[PDB]
Amino acid sequence: ELITENMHMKLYMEGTVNNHHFKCTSEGEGKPYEGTQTQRIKVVEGGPLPFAFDILATSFSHTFINHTQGIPDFWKQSFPEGFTWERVTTYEDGGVLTATQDTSLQDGCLIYNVKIRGVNFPSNGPVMQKKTLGWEAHTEMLYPADGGLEGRADLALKLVGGGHLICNFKTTYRSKKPAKNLKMPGVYYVDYRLERIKEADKETYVEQHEVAVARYCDLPSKL
């Protein structure tokens, strides 16, 4: 009843990649239960960025997952309290991005505060030469663990030349809401598709859209 069929969000992010500091912000909107969302991002500080903006794209929304099959919604359940997520992405060429997030509810609008932290990206790899062309769609595996939710996934980032560079996500979602107040979910999976719908001024303004669906596997079962 506090998460409605249309909401808004407003974001703020600060961080450092191989020691280039920047800050960013956005507003956005979508449909928490149809699973859809758009965000409008401007690098407000530290731009143009000397790295490809696709490494940051997965840091800008877990309230907007469309949840099929009575799978309880760890995320919509967390409010009004909200929730935090905390990650680490290891790229398969040495780059490690650690990110820590806070989602909170203030005035019908959802609020995101994120700190990014990047190091050891290779200086003639793609992130740093900006040879990248967006993320492929991906599936995240999820499973309660220790008072929160743990997530695990590999995404593939497309490159000029045609191959991909792979990366790992390790994520933990802890409730900003004392357990008693939340049913946990089994093991399950969320499928994403995150897309870049517009950029301008060498990525100092970006528009991003995402569809997410939660479901089980459907492979039958001899068990």
Buried b (16+ CB within 10 A) or exposed e, 40-63: bbbbeebbebbbbbbbbbbbbbbb
Which of 44, 35, 37, 36 has its CA nearest to residue 12? 44
- Structural contact between residues 12 and 27, judged by C-beta atoms closer than 8 angstroms: no
Round to whole Å and give the CA distance between 85 and 68: 22
Torsion region of 45: left, alpha or beta (phi above 0 gives left; psi -120 to 50 gives alpha) = beta
How do beta strands 205-215 and 109-119 pair? unpaired
Report the structure determination method: X-ray
Q: Write down all domains in the chain, each with its CATH number in brackets.
A: 1-223 (2.40.155.10)
Q: Which helix (H) or strand (E) holds 153?
A: strand 148-159
DSSP-assigned letter for residue 184: P
